[PDB]
Structures are given as structure tokens and as C-alpha cells.
Design a binder for this molecule. Structure first.
Ligand code: CA
Ligand code: CA
Ligand code: CA
Ligand code: CA
Ligand code: CA
Ligand code: CA
Lengths: 544, 544, 544
């Protein structure tokens, strides 16, 4: 009914402690989504082209060619930590728990309203009570999956501020070639957009693949409750790298007085020691030689682009880096860098139109430091001669800036690593699994990955508001009455975490407020706000 | 439904006499609350600063520094005697009863309506039937408690006049220093606002702490019925001060003829009398010496400011004063002074913008008269020499205007006193108890204090009315359609009083109308009105 | 049996999460108590006397006279946080919970062993399997209560290090006088130890008041399980001082641009404002004038010694202080200062024999800053003249260093304050209540206070090991065989805490390890260790 409300705004989280310390966190989100009528009621296929840019020689990475079907539908996407937990709850979940399990997820659209604008320099807005807002929910997932969180196009992270959905659009198959080159490269590299291969053509439309519901003021649509099925994320980090795995060499000479220079001592000739190693040659048994069960971490090619059918692309790393030898200044390939607008973090009161960025660097020691790597000649005669050793300092291919470690992959049967950690408050939450016959061991964008099917996509769109003049048989773009619309949105994501227990004697790391961050969690005398990213795996944990 | 009313205006009290004379007074209140859209849809943190003023030297008391979170929500507060009883009922409850007990309290919001304004010099108002009024009810009390009655910001005291709620805002932790000084004080006293201590930072938002309900014309929200749990107020006053406690000395010579100068007479040398005293020294047993069981009242420091973390503040007194030696002209520390606007008392037809004030002076003799105090030397040799006596006339610290009684506290185990009386029609009714481990024996602002939890707070706010243009990703303050709203409010406060009985031969005090006040309870030929404060503990009562 | 163990060393804590988040923390403690034979098998009455010291004039505070009954029994006391939680668990209990409730407490003595020493320069130790260790347990509390934790004489805070019980001794009634004096004081002040008043003489002996159990190797004694009955401690702190209580003045001019100097503004003449105050005089309504319900905190006399029967003693304060204006440098009367040895904190590897000290300064803003206090003349005419104001700068009694605030007590009916917080790891846990007819509202040494009866005291003592020569009828101190003894001790203290929930948007304070404290929770290359004190009420909480 017009004068009747059809739902309830609620943005309240709820920790429900149960038996055996397994809390049941119920995060509720409500927002006031705002929505205008499409630029055109049509589906368009468009090609983005920037030859000129990549045509520079030694500029291949700045490639941007591609094609896309530009649907007239907007997409309401709430997949991002910043939509379900304020900083206050994120500090709770991160300090006290150890593992999170995604459980359900339900959402509805209530209190819909549609209005229409009129001139002159004085616009006038009046309800159009018979108009309709279209909602459609691709539940089976006939529609291609497009996680908005990857281009900061999710929902507002502040409950007390309106928000908006993103215009949906998806990738359309296209061939394209482009040969790599540096600056000194002579001539012109084949840089061409070939076109399309019919065998891979796929044009989707909501109309034909999903049942669209029309809603009027008095209406309201609510999805069902979906239950995720997939592995538990953890909120602990490991630090033991292959070098701190096992039983330490038994010292024979323990130091006799406190002193930053009083080191105990193994006390046994490197080649007279007992133990095991994989070096059939020597009899040396050092910390870098002894034999650790397997290998934490792996070495992968850095800033290497591979390329197929549609063009060059970076070769994703799952380890990253980190360390007393990074400090974000040394931030290398691996550590993800988030760039975002005012809706999700950047100081609202901030003008100018430059994104806000931060490079997340996890607490886990499982990435590598290439500098220290090296390779010796099987014979193993040390001190190693220059001819028998290949360092990260020696050039490869003849390039001064390229070393062996730059094309090195050490990923093998004995590799062990962890899944990407949650990145509050800009990270994705769940991601759909690849429909390939052999799937990845992890997605580098999401902590959780629905095994079976992921929740479906929810699309909305303001129904066409025809005037009194209209003739389809004409080429002229139809003309509609200006009509925008506002409606409320409310989801409910429910994870089930497990409490933590202290095993150490020493206290551990804990997220906390200090005289230094103190002002990142309060608004400005203007009403300015901002959400500063938090790390999510504070406490350590034995790996072996 | 739009064309349907959803409630009933009722401002009618009801005394329901039961068995054993224990009436059940049911005061009902209805008002037509009026409400505009927030200045900004944001929460702001602001600091009030008036260095300049307190920077005068000998001006510390006029300090006004502090910080506050300025929420975009209004608060409907009906906590004040002037909202539930007209003068007519207040005369009833005060003349015939003896003790009041707070019992329940329920309230609802019915008949909501939202409108929108349009130009030119001719404004035009039209219903926006799809718009929504937001109501939220912090029942658990997650929200900080802010009794409006302390700044005359409660609801209208006249049922036949519209009214409005107050913009909510609460105190935000902040340090600050300021050294006391008088005029002759040389140099500059450390007068600085230090800032904030993170460890005490608390930013609350309704959105995240309470479920907000959206209402449309056809909607209506009603809270539940809460049952207060706390001590009974009384409507009698005591007069016996330590000097009229017990068995009077037995007179030996009763006067023989009427005469303002015919005093009877004890007839026994002050040092040959029998009885008890606490003066191990002397053998004198006068009315000022004999031993009364305990001590009615206590002496406290007057116009003394103490100071902690956030600045100087007056040290509240719970006794006040009063007497044939006050007459409000002598009104000292203790007696509260109320200052208020047209909504609650000041003559409506009165122009100019100066508040209306009155200093309430209770009927109970339990305060003190410092003038008459004094201290003698243990030896007790009278007439007391100047060296053995310290009077309220002798200067302390060397200040001509400061005497010993000015820093004197006589509050001790034997102290007895009463709880603050009801102050019609500007006084608060109930107050929430301090969440401290050791609580006060009384609040000096409320007669009743909920032991457990006090009724929750009700906040309302006009939902954002977005136009057709809006982009969150921009720093510019959003722009909304002008929208105000009106709705009805109705509460029901139910106390349960007990009737009184005459024990004396002489009649007692009674509130009544006379040729002198006669025109404070009728309107003016203009429609002018006003509510004059009434005392509430008319009849006397034996203390011991 | 000799070759049979009679118990189990266990120093393991256990958090048992139940329904509604109310964990059940079970702290277990085991230690290897070590014990020698008494210096003499007799009870002695001794008098400590240091006239000479206090006889200095202006040295009264350094008084140490008293008498004591020196029993031949040792006392095993485990009353101290440092005995039940390592830092690791203390960080858990403090960061995640909100209130603790003491629940039970049981303890036993198992695996007893007695040995005996023999010469020459070569001592030889041999089991004396028939010898006996005496254990006695004053359960009814016939014995005077002596909490060892007040002189750092509790049990070892490290499970992997042996420990020892304290020689028991208790206060014996004695009169004594001593007149206060400063340096310039002429002549000699009456400084005398008067002796004893028979009417207060009380000589207690374990033998006559408790059943002593003899134990041999194969024996083992276990007490019962006692259930404490007393109030819950809290792990939150308040910050609102009278100045941040209530509804903040409604600002009329909110600032228009971010700026450390952009303060909003009340915008209404200090004497034209509405509201309530207790100043019958003026019409000013400032933040230091308006009327707050009651008064958080109280002002008490500082570094004031009172004196009765047995001599001068400091007048304990329950508020302390703290603030941006203390920093421990300003640490004044109130904040307790702990001094301790290697057994409980001081760096074990540290030589020299100076105690380790730290002044605990709580997070709660409920103490005062005397500097800012002041008093005005009732008339209230500001700017305040020097004659009408008495500041903390003006001398009292004629002493340059004494001001009015130095003898000021503002404790009155309206006072509100909290109970002392837990002081890890040197603080006492429970304390016995005074057997007075009117008891204190709090003990300043313990967070918990058994209402009924406190657990009883456990005393141990090595039974007399007579030689072949012995004649009681002789004055010569008997002669025994040298005999020491070792035994194990194990208690189990069980509190029941309640989990916490986030209400704020901003994260809160949390105990945590950082590059700065990092080495206070790990041992030294020598085996050095130490326990650094932790604060226990991290998170804030609305007071009103
Ligand atoms: Ca093909
Ligand atoms: Ca690390
Ligand atoms: Ca602090
Ligand atoms: Ca009177
Ligand atoms: Ca006596
Ligand atoms: Ca503080």
C-alpha cells in the first residue's frame, strides 16, 4: 500500500555465544540505495581501444583494449567486508577469534519509491505512484559473474549515507595481438585488435534469462536465505619459514652472561656433525643445509606478463612478500594494492579527484626475499667461485636489470602455503569458483570460495516511462519521462566463528586504538569520515 | 492507510480510588510534535571553546569548553511534571496525598504526515505520500542518557499548542586545564584545552545500535509498557531540626497570663541540671548542648568548584537552605534555580528573548544558616574569648570574604536528610542511576531514580529525500528536497499514590487560588498563557 | 607410601565457554614450596623501636614502633594475581571480558619430603623417612588475618622456580604517643612508647586454636573447596566526570570547515540561557554552573596523617588521581605504589638489593586535580576579587606550602565512585571484611571482599626433631637435628567472567605486545625473567 512501510532498516551486528565457544556473528546491513533511469534502454556492444598509448614501445603494460556488452541494468553488489562490519566489530572478530566460517546470506528490497523531474530552472519532483522499479535475481547464475568489489563498486560503508548500484556490463570475446618491446625497440611492434571469434560469442540479456519482478511503492521483494558451502578462513598467521622448522641444533656452549653479543654455541665442526641433508656431495650440515620436511612458500616470476588470445596480463602471485626488509617501500609483486573512492574509505570531505590507496602487507612469513637467493654448481666447493655461482646480481639474457630470480619458479610437490587473508574494509568476501575441470588451489581475491554455486546476482532497473508520443517503427531513440527512484536494501550475512585460547606465556598482537590512529575512528567537525584498513590475522600459530 | 487515522489524541488524567485509599492516578498526554529535516545527514564532532571569556582572570566559573557528537537525530523527551499534570491536577495530588510511586509508562507515535516545500515568494506545500519518518527506540540504553528537562528542552506543557523534539547530541571525552585566579591575579593562568584521551573515546550512532522503523502516513509505532522499579516520593515535609528533637526540658515555672512576653521557665541552674551531653568538659546542659540522637542535615562547602580531567565544576549540595532568614533574597547554594522559555511556562505573549526564572525553595528545614555557626576551644571556658573561638566573621587563608564555614563539611555517619521534592512544572521526574560501583544516596535533579534500567530513549528523524541528482563519490554535501513532517505523540504515565489523614488539631497548608495568583490560571484576552511553579510538599510530618 | 607419589603438579588455566557468553576460567597453580625449621620452637612477643629516627623533628612519618607475636609457624599464602595467571592469560581476561566473579578455591599439599644436614665442610643430606611436616588450617578464622600480598610475601609467580612460605607473626596491642613537628620545631616532642593496655591483650597460638595434622612422605593433605560470596569486579573504566554528564548545551553555530581552531558555538549570552543550576544568586549557566545529577568522585585531605591509640598513620584515599596532568611524575596521594623482590617480578638476574617499584595509575577519571579547585564568596560577583576568592595558591594556617585544598573533604551523600581495579601481577585478590558494625564501602587493597567468611589460613611447620639429649626442666634452648623440608602445593582458583560486546564505532584499547615491551615476556640468554605490571580496565563504559 502507498501509505504503508514494507520493511525495517536495521544495521546491527549480533554475536551469539554458544556451547564450546563458537560464537554466531550475525551482521545485518541496511542502506538507502538511490537509482536513476538508464542512459538508453538498449544493450550495446562496445570496444575500448587505446592503441596510441601502448603504441609507445616499452609501454605494453598500459594496455586497455577489450569489448563489453553494456546492459541497461544496474547491479546491487554487497560483497565486501566494509559493508557488514564497522571498525568496532572488526576489532572484536580479529582479536578474540581464530577461524571464521561463512554460513548464510539473505536480502530484500523494501520501501520502494519512484519520482519524476520537471522544469524550468526550478525543477519540481512529484511522486509517480503507478510507476514501477524492476528487480531481477539471477539465482542459477545464468548471468556471468561480476564481483564489484574488484573496482571499488560495492555498497556504501556508512549506514547513515545513501548509496548507489553499479551499471552492469560484462566481457565479450575478442582476439587481439601486441608484441612486447622496450624503448630502444626499433620499428613498430604488431599491435592490433583482431576482432571476434564466433565460436566464443555469448550475448546475454536479463530479459531472456531471469524472471523480472515489477514493484510499486507498496511492494517489496526479498530473496531467500542461501547457505554457503566452503572452507573456513583463519585469523592467525604463521611465521616459521623452512629455517625454523624442526629440532634446533643442540648447542654445546650456552652463553654465561647477559649481552647483545653473547651468543651460545653449537660447538661442533660443520663437517663432523650428525643429522640429515639432501646434498649427496658435502658433509656440511648447517642451518641452510640440514633437511626440513617440506617447503613453506614458493618462488615465482616477478612482473612477468604472459599472454593469450586476448592480450598480455600479469602473472598473479599467491605469496606476496613482507618483512623487516620491505616496509611497503620494498613492497614487491604479491602484496595487493587497494585504490578507492569516498564511498568506501577515502576521507569524504576530501576534494580533488584522486583515489585513495594502500598496499596491504600480511603478517605471514611465507613470501620470499629474492636478493638473498643464489645457485651453486653441484660439486659444491666453497668458498664458491664466480663461475660456479649464479647470483641475483648477475644479468640474464644480457639485460642489466634482469637476473635469474626474475624468471624463477620453485613451485613443486613439496610446496605449502596459506590462503589469502581478509582485507578490511575493502576486500571481497566470497568468490565463485572457476568452471574449469582442474581448479586453482586458491583465489587471490577472496578468503572464501563457494564450492557448489555462489549466491545469485541481484539486478535492478527503473522501468521505461513512455510519454504520449512513441513509435517503435522509428530509428529515433525513444523518449521517456525523467524518472529516478530510491529504495531500501537490507542483507544479513551470518558467519560462525570459534573463540581463541592462549598457549604462550607472552601476550600477543592485538588491534587497538592509540594516540596515533585515534582520529581515524571519529568524525570531523564537518562530518568528515573515513575507514582505515585493518590487518586481520594478528596472532601467531605453530605451523609445524 | 492514507485516508485512515491511526490513533487517538487524549490528554486526560484519571484518579482511580481503590481499597484502603491508594488512588491510581493515570496521567495521559498527547501532543502534535512538529519536525524538520536535519541540517546535514551527518554525525559531527564539535568543540566548544571560549578561552577569551575565562581568560579574564577571576572568571573561571564562566568556563564553557567541551566537545560533542552532534547526531542528525531529534529526541522526543517527555520527562517533566509539566507534561503530565495541568495545575488543576497538581493541586489535587499535592493537597490530598502523601506519597507517590512511579508505576509504568507507555508511548506511541500515530497519524504521521510528511510534506514538502516549493517556491517562489509563494511557497507551496504538498503531501509526499511515499516519504518516510524514521523512529528508533534505544530500549536497552546503548545510547548515552540525555535528560532534556535539564535545559528546558522537554515537551510542550500545553496540549492545545504544537511542539517540537530536541536535536540530540552527546558529550565526547576531552582533557582540559584551567587554573583558578582572581582579578588581582598577575600573569596568565594555564588555560588550555588539551585534546582527547583515546582510552576514553566513544562514538555512538543510532544506525549501528538500534533498529530504526520507517513509517508512512498509514503507519504508527507504539512502544511497550515499561514498569519503573524505585522508591516512593513523599509529599510531606519535616521541620524538626536537631533543636526540636526529643523530650523538651521540663519547665518549672509556667507563665501566669497571656502575653507576648510571658515565657515559661525551666527554673534550674544550667550546671545543676540532669540529662545527657557529649561535652566531657562542662556540666552545662542547654538546648544547644544536650544530646540529640543524630543529626538532621549536614554542612557542605559553598560555591566551591572542584576539578578533574575535563575542567572546573560546582560541587552540588543536597540540602539547600530556606527560612525566615532567606526569602529567596538570601537564597544560597543548594536551592535550584529554573530558567525557561515559552514552551514551558514563560508568558507566551511575552516578547524579547530573556528566559523566565524562579528559585525553588522547599518547605523542609534541613538546610543550614552558616552565619550562626561557630567553633570553640575544647576547654570550653565561656564567655568565649576571641582566641578560643573561630566565627563565620573571621577570615580564612587571609581572604576578607572567606570564612571557615566556607570550606566546612559536617557530613558524617550520623547524617539524616530527605530526597529532593517534585518541582512542578519544570522538574525532571525519573533519572537514570550512575553506573558506578558505589552510587549516590540521591540525585539532586530527580525525585525518582530507576534502580534497574530506565525507560529507553525515543529518537525520530525525517528520512533523506534525495533528488534526481546524487553521487556519493563526491565531496559536496548531498542535496535533498525540503521536507518537514508532523506526527502525533501520546504517552501514559501511571503513578499510584496513597491518601492522607489528619493527625493534628490545627488545619494544615494547602495549595489554593487567591485574589493574588488568580490570574496565573486563566488565559489572557490575547490567548496568552503561563504556568507558575508550585511547591509540592505542603503538609508537615513528625521526623522523630 | 614412601615410594609412591601422592598428587599431581598442574599449572594450567582453562576457559570453559558456556551459554550466553559467560566463560568459566579455571586457574590452576602448583609450586614446589621449600621449608626450613623455625629459628626457635617458641612464641615470642617483640617490640620494634626506632625513637632515634622519628626523634629527628619533622620526621614523624618515618615512625616504625609496634609489637608483634612472632609465631614459629610459616604461612603459605597464595593471594595475588601473579600466582594464578601468567601474562598470556591476563591479556585474554582483560581484552575480551567485562566482569569477573570470584567463585571457589581449593588447595592441597602433596608429595611431602623431609631431609637432614650433616658435616664437615662437606654437608651430607639424607632422608629422615620417619620425620613429620606439620600442617594446620585455621578454617573458622580464629587466627588473625594477615594477607601476605601487602608486603610482597606471597608465592612465586613462576611455576618453574621453587618457592617459600612466610614466617607468620601478628600485631600485639600497644599504646604509644608522638607529637608532630617540623624541622624548625624547638625542644623535644613527646615521643614515647607507653606500653600495653591489658583490656586489649590477645595472645593466639595455633596449637590451641587449630587441629594440626602431621604428614610423612606418604601422606598428603588437601583442603576442601570454598565458595566465595561477594560482588563482581569489572574490567571497564569510566571517564565522564561531572563535566560530561547529561545533555550538552545545544550549539547554535556549528563550524563550517575543518580546522583545529574551528570550534562550534553555543551562541547565547551566559545570562540569558535556559536550564538549571544550584546558584540561587546568578543567572549564569555555564558548563561549570549548570546542574549535574550527582557528583562523580570526592575531594580528600592529602598527605594528612591522623592518629589514635597506637600512633600516626596516613589517611587512605580511594580515588587516587591520574591524567594528562600526572604522567606518574605528578603521581599524588591515591595512586598505590608497589615495591617488590625477585620472586614476584624484579628481574631475577638482577643483583644488588634494591626493590623493584611501580606506581599503578588507573584508566578511570574519578580522581581530582587540586590545582584547579577554588572557592568564591556566596555573592558571586565576577571577575572574582582576591578578597572573595580562596585559591589553591593562598596559604592556610600561615604555612607557605599548605593551601585550603590540603585539608578539604567533599565526600557527601551525592558521592559516586568505583571499586579499586585489579593490579596484575602484584595485587591482592580477595580481602576479609572488617568486623565492625559499620563497614567500609570498599577496601583499597582488594577488588573482592568476602561478605561472610574468607577462606581460612594454611600454616605449615617442620615438627621438632629432638636429639638423644633433652631435658625440658632446663632453661637452655633445646637442641634439634637440622632438618629442612620440601613439599608440593597446588591450588585452584575459579572465577566466572562474562564476555564483552562492541557498542562503539571506534575500536577500543587493548593490551598488546609491541616492539617496545616485546622483551618483557621472554627469558634472557641467562634464564633471566621478569613480570611487568599490566593495567586491567582497558575499555571505556558509559557512566550515565
Ligand atoms: Ca574459432
Ligand atoms: Ca613477521
Ligand atoms: Ca590514557
Ligand atoms: Ca519552615
Ligand atoms: Ca583500658
Ligand atoms: Ca582518561
Amino acid at each position: 500500500g502507498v501509505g504503508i512501510s514494507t520493511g525495517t532498516f536495521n544495521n546491527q551486528t549480533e554475536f551469539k555465544f554458544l556451547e564450546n565457544g563458537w560464537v554466531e556473528i550475525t551482521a545485518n546491513s541496511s542502506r538507502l540505495v538511490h537509482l536513476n533511469m538508464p542512459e538508453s534502454e538498449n544493450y550495446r556492444r562496445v570496444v575500448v581501444n587505446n592503441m596510441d598509448k601502448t603504441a609507445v614501445n616499452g609501454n605494453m603494460a598500459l594496455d586497455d583494449i577489450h569489448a563489453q556488452i553494456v546492459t541497461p541494468w544496474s547491479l546491487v553488489d554487497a560483497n565486501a567486508w566494509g559493508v557488514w562490519f564497522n571498525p568496532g566489530d572488526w576489532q572484536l572478530i580479529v582479536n578474540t577469534m581464530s577461524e571464521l566460517h561463512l554460513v548464510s546470506f539473505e536480502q530484500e528490497i523494501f520501501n520502494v519509491v519512484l519520482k519524476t523531474v520537471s522544469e524550468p530552472p526550478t525543477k519540481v519532483y512529484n511522486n509517480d505512484l503507478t510507476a514501477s522499479l524492476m528487480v531481477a535475481l539471477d539465482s542459477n547464475n545464468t548471468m556471468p559473474f561480476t564481483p564489484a568489489a574488484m573496482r571499488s563498486e560495492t555498497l556504501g560503508f556508512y549506514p547513515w549515507k545513501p548509496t548507489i548500484p553499479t551499471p552492469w556490463r560484462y566481457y565479450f570475446q575478442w582476439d587481439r595481438t601486441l608484441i612486447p618491446s622496450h624503448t630502444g625497440t626499433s620499428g613498430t611492434p604488431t599491435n592490433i585488435y583482431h576482432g571476434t571469434d564466433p565460436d566464443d560469442v555469448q550475448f546475454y540479456t536479463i530479459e531472456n534469462s531471469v524472471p523480472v519482478h515489477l514493484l510499486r511503492t507498496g511492494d517489496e521483494f526479498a530473496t531467500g536465505t542461501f547457505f554457503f558451502d566452503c572452507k573456513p578462513c583463519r585469523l592467525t598467521h604463521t611465521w616459521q619459514t623452512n629455517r625454523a622448522l624442526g629440532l634446533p641444533p643442540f648447542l654445546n656452549s650456552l652463553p654465561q652472561s647477559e649481552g647483545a653479543t653473547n651468543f651460545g654455541d653449537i660447538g661442533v665442526q660443520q663437517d663432523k656433525r650428525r643429522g640429515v641433508t639432501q646434498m649427496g656431495n658435502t658433509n656440511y650440515i648447517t642451518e641452510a643445509t640440514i633437511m626440513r620436511p617440506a617447503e613453506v612458500g614458493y618462488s615465482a616470476p616477478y612482473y612477468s606478463f604472459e599472454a593469450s588470445t586476448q592480450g598480455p596480463f600479469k602473472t598473479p602471485i599467491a605469496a606476496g612478500r613482507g618483512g623487516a626488509q620491505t616496509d611497503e617501500n620494498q613492497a614487491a609483486d604479491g602484496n595487493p594494492r587497494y585504490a578507492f573512492g569516498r564511498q568506501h574509505g577515502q576521507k569524504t570531505t576530501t576534494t580533488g579527484e584522486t583515489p585513495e590507496r594502500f598496499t596491504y602487507i600480511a603478517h605471514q612469513d611465507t613470501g620470499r626475499y629474492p636478493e638473498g637467493d643464489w645457485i651453486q654448481n653441484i660439486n659444491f666447493n666453497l668458498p664458491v667461485t664466480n663461475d660456479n655461482v649464479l647470483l641475483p646480481t648477475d644479468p640474464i639474457g644480457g639485460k642489466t636489470g634482469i637476473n635469474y630470480t626474475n624468471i624463477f619458479n620453485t613451485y613443486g610437490p613439496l610446496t605449502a602455503l596459506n590462503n589469502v587473508p581478509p582485507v578490511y574494509p575493502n576486500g571481497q568476501i566470497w568468490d565463485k569458483e572457476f568452471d574449469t575441470d582442474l581448479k586453482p588451489r586458491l583465489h587471490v581475491n577472496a578468503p572464501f570460495v563457494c564450492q557448489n554455486n555462489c549466491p545469485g546476482q541481484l539486478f535492478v532497473k527503473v522501468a521505461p516511462n513512455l510519454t504520449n508520443e512513441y513509435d517503435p517503427d522509428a530509428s529515433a531513440n525513444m523518449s521517456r519521462i525523467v524518472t529516478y527512484s530510491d529504495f531500501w536494501w537490507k542483507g544479513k550475512l551470518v558467519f560462525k566463528a570459534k573463540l581463541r585460547a592462549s598457549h604462550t606465556w607472552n601476550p600477543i598482537q592485538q588491534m587497538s586504538i592509540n594516540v596515533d590512529n585515534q582520529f581515524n575512528y571519529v568524525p570531523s567537525n564537518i562530518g568528515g569520515m573515513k575507514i582505515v584498513y585493518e590487518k586481520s590475522q594478528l596472532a601467531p600459530r605453530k605451523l609445524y
